[PDB]
Amino acid sequence: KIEEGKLVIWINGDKGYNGLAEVGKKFEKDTGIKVTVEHPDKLEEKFPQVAATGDGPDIIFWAHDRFGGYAQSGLLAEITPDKAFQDKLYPFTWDAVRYNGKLIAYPIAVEALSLIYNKDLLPNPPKTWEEIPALDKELKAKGKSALMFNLQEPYFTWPLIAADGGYAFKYENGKYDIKDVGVDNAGAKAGLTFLVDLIKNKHMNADTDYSIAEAAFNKGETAMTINGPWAWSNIDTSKVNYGVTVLPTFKGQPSKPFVGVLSAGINAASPNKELAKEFLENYLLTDEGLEAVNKDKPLGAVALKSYEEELAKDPRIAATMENAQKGEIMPNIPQMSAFWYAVRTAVINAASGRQTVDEALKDAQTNAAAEFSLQDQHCESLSLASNISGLQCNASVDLIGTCWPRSPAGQLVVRPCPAFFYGVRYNTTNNGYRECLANGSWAARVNYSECQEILNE
Ligand SMILES: OC[C@H]1O[C@H](O[C@H]2[C@H](O)[C@@H](O)[C@@H](O)O[C@@H]2CO)[C@H](O)[C@@H](O)[C@@H]1O
Numbered sequence: 001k002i003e004e005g006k007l008v009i010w011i012n013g014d015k016g017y018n019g020l021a022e023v024g025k026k027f028e029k030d031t032g033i034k035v036t037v038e039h040p041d042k043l044e045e046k047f048p049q050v051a052a053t054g055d056g057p058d059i060i061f062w063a064h065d066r067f068g069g070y071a072q073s074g075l076l077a078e079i080t081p082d083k084a085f086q087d088k089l090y091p092f093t094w095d096a097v098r099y100n101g102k103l104i105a106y107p108i109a110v111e112a113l114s115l116i117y118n119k120d121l122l123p124n125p126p127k128t129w130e131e132i133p134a135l136d137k138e139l140k141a142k143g144k145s146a147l148m149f150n151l152q153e154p155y156f157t158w159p160l161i162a163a164d165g166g167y168a169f170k171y172e173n174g175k176y177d178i179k180d181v182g183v184d185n186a187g188a189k190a191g192l193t194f195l196v197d198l199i200k201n202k203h204m205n206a207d208t209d210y211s212i213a214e215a216a217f218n219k220g221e222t223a224m225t226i227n228g229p230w231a232w233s234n235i236d237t238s239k240v241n242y243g244v245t246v247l248p249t250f251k252g253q254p255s256k257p258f259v260g261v262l263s264a265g266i267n268a269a270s271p272n273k274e275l276a277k278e279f280l281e282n283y284l285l286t287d288e289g290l291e292a293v294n295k296d297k298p299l300g301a302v303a304l305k306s307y308e309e310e311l312a313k314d315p316r317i318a319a320t321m322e323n324a325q326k327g328e329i330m331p332n333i334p335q336m337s338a339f340w341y342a343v344r345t346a347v348i349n350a351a352s353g354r355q356t357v358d359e360a361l362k363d364a365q366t367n368a369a370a371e372f373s374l375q376d377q378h379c380e381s382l383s384l385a386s387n388i389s390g391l392q393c394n395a396s397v398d399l400i401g402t403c404w405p406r407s408p409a410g411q412l413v414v415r416p417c418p419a420f421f422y423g424v425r426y427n428t429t430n431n432g433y434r435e436c437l438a439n440g441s442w443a444a445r446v447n448y449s450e451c452q453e454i455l456n457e
Pocket of ligand 1: 260340
């Protein structure tokens with residue numbers, strides 16, 4: 001458990017943490033409270049793993065789209081800023097952090113991906129995606145490359161996939177339809193087909209991650225990169241003469257990046273709740289506070305009206321806003337992470353040719369919509385027919401495909417042993433045993449010691 005009398009904050013390592021550290025350093029010699037800022041790898045997934053065990057940081061910075069999930073697991077306190085404080089920020093940023101009626105975080109900044117290009121290597125930037133393959137074949141000559149960006153994270157490839165009709169969840173009569181998923185329609189299919197083709201013809205390498213693309217652009221090896229306002233800082237230091245511009249169109253349609261609002265949540269387990277509120281409202285979300293972070297790594301447009309009034313003239317902020325305009329603010333519904341993971345997997349499996357586009361994307365449809373396997377359905381039909389009173393274990397299938405049907409609590413359940421002729425599973429004459437516990441959980445212990453064939457296999 002986190003201790004009382006300090007503040008532990010987590011932010012992504014691509015953001016201006018050292019800028020945030022100074023705000024906490026100003027906070028420290030003002031109230032007398034130690035603020036230590038960290039930036040763990042895989043933060044957005046690490047937070048729920050530590051939190052639910054009452055162990056996270058006090059405050060957490062991530063784009064708003066993950067917050068609905070956190071809120072549903074009960075990891076976030078609901079924030080209580082007065083009407084005076086709410087007026088200091090843009091209404092739409094508040095919408096982004098509003099979940100099931102309640103405000104669940106403080107909005108900080110509006111992020112959108114932009115096309116970044118090298119002016120010395122590329123006077124005029126391409127307007128269409130279709131002309132980049134033609135462009136890279138010219139840059140073959142001078143040992144340079146047209147375009148590299150993070151192909152590991154579907155945030156970067158989504159703008160292309162969304163362009164021609166692909167979407168996450170259908171919005172419908174003031175709500176998202178979590179079963180209606182635009183991940184393998186004609187539009188999404190086209191977009192990825194096009195991406196996959198850039199790698200086949202060797203215009204990009206499927207193993208290109210964030211820091212590979214970053215290093216390539218900033219040293220002058222590549223002509224373009226796709227990135228957000230945080231990236232700018234290092235590019236300045238590099239002294240590369242760069243432009244920030246509207247993302248290329250695909251099939252005459254604009255790229256549609258998913259816009260994120262950087263946001264700060266309060267750990268529901270954290271005792272230091274008022275102290276956390278004290279920090280964000282009075283120290284971070286201020287001209288000074290936000291300026292300090294922005295200097296370190298640019299935030300984009302900021303949620304605080306007053307300080308946004310300052311940054312507005314920056315042509316690069318304009319470009320961010322032009323792209324954000326073409327795209328959309330992400331939903332914050334708890335299914336967003338199932339969506340992201342689906343697309344993350346689709347893109348990588350296709351990127352490496354483990355799957356075709358259509359296989360990769362039909363899988364993504366499955367994944368994103370939280371749909372039931374055939375195996376799931378088969379197993380659930382095993383008890384539906386006969387009725388039990390009281391606590392029950394839900395049907396589930398274990399990692400060797402044994403179906404443990406819905407069963408009464410506190411009972412031993414007997415199922416046929418698995419065996420496999422090559423890929424073909426079948427059931428033997430022997431049995432495996434598993435207890436359904438008094439509390440409706442399946443026991444971790446599964447006795448397979450009589451399963452003669454599988455032991456031999
Ligand atoms: O790649 C999917 C990923 O995209 C977004 O994460 C962004 C984040 O919002 C940006 O601020 C920046 O740090 O880059 C991240 C991409 O690595 C979503 O916010 C996130 O939920 C999603 O998984």
